[PDB]
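Anyone have tokens for Cmr2dHD? Sequence:
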Amino acid sequence: SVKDPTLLRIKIVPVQPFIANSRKQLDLWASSHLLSMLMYKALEVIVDKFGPEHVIYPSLRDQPFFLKFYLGENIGDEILVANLPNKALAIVSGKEAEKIEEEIKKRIRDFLLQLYREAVDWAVENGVVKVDRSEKDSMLKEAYLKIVREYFTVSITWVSLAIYPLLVKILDSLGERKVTEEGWKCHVCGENLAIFGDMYDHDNLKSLWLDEEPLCPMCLIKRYYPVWIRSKTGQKIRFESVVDVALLYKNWRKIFDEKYGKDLVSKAREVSEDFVKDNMLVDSDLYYSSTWESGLDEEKVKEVVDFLNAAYKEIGNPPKYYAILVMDGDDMGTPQVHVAISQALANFSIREVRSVVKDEGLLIYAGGDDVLAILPVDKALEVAYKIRKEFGKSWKLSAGILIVHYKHPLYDALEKARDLLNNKAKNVPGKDTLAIGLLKRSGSYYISLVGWELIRVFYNSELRKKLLGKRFIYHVLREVDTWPKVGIDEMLKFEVIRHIKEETKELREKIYGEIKDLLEHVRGNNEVEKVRGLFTFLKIITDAEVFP
Ligand SMILES: Nc1ncnc2c1ncn2[C@@H]1O[C@H](COP(=O)(O)OP(=O)(O)O)[C@@H](O)[C@H]1O
Ligand SMILES: [Ca+2]
Ligand SMILES: [Ca+2]
Ligand SMILES: [Zn+2]
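Reply: yep, here.
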């Protein structure tokens, strides 16, 4: 702790607008990973000037960005998760403080500009932007340069110096103030000028861009970033599309490939060479008959539809839904103790979340108290529960899980999932809540707010064991659309009795009991709403279109 000790805070924004409008999983991953990369660029300045132990939060001890890009360790696929938060604080000597602010702003600025230059070279060379090698240099003109340059605001503030917590709660003040100090649009985000959008007409713009959807510098950077990463590391995310996550359901793709796979790729090539690339389907949505029927020789297409249906009949229907899991710690909250809680969170987000998600879906971000993952629907509930338990062992957590159809617009899905977390789970008194929602392709939306222990109770329950029945759920739910005049207890006893050898006597007794127990852990201020919660939950996890 030397010398002229100063406490310094860094915040990088925007986060949610940047990550928010992402039209594809790969973009979403790239937004998240790039943001964390920016924080790496920031903290590296402090490590260079002082040392790793000078960063109080986040704790750098296990950080894969530092192990790889700093020390050169070979860490493999772990590098694909973003673990670095957009806020940090460190201890620096007061004389260094301003020097450090400048150096950081600059390093982020220059990093982004370099990515952008590399990005246009890549774009022109790979034909994502169809333009001569002459006019590539118009893409580098001062305007777009200034867009890249000013896109992220990096706020830095420092207080001088056991009353530690006091001033610790101060810098978010000047740091709260600093964030507030300040042609044709892009077709992806919509929020920035498109590259050629100023010097050209619309048709003159849309035409020359790949898929007639021009990008601003920011989204061009997003598009290049996974290639940047696959060159700097040898790594690329295992599942590029949400369909690829969706099909992890019940190992459906593994078993399908193993049995019917080669035959399918051949049937598809037999239709057209353009559906098959490297003895694989060009699109994972091609595992769906529905896509062969609609979206785009019709006899050999019928042959693929027939083939698929047959295979479904043997192996089961194809999964069309996936889950977005969003988690955040509730009300989260002495310098050595600050380091202790920081290291606790770091171990959680780097080690433990990873160890529960693993290969079973895509972990995009673990930022200490925050998590973002895309999961197959049959892993969503247990991944959320297990991560919750892990966090408790380090303390409480709310989550939202949006189950959505593969064709639903990603930015809207993320908006909704994040809404589930913030406007529902977080608005329950005491919080510590899971908000589950299911947005059916038809457009009907089902939400249920439960407590974490509803998952364990339901897990162990005979009721669950039996549920794998339907008419039951439908009837109890039909009863609570408004409410039974006969009251809840009576309606429930009636309904249980109505759907169960004579061992029924005990079964009915235990179930009714279990339900009562389960009802305890559903959120809501009265029993009818608690039954609605419980039974909507049940309707969701048993839905045959969603869980086929
Ligand atoms: N690299 C990243 N990838 C994905 N999400 C991120 C990243 N960095 C920050 N975030 C998200 O941005 C949010 C900003 O958090 P914050 O401003 O503290 O709001 P709150 O007070 O609700 O926590 C966090 O919830 C975090 O999940
Ligand atoms: Ca929080
Ligand atoms: Ca948070
Ligand atoms: Zn854009």
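The chain has four domains: 1-240, 241-318, 319-451, 452-548.
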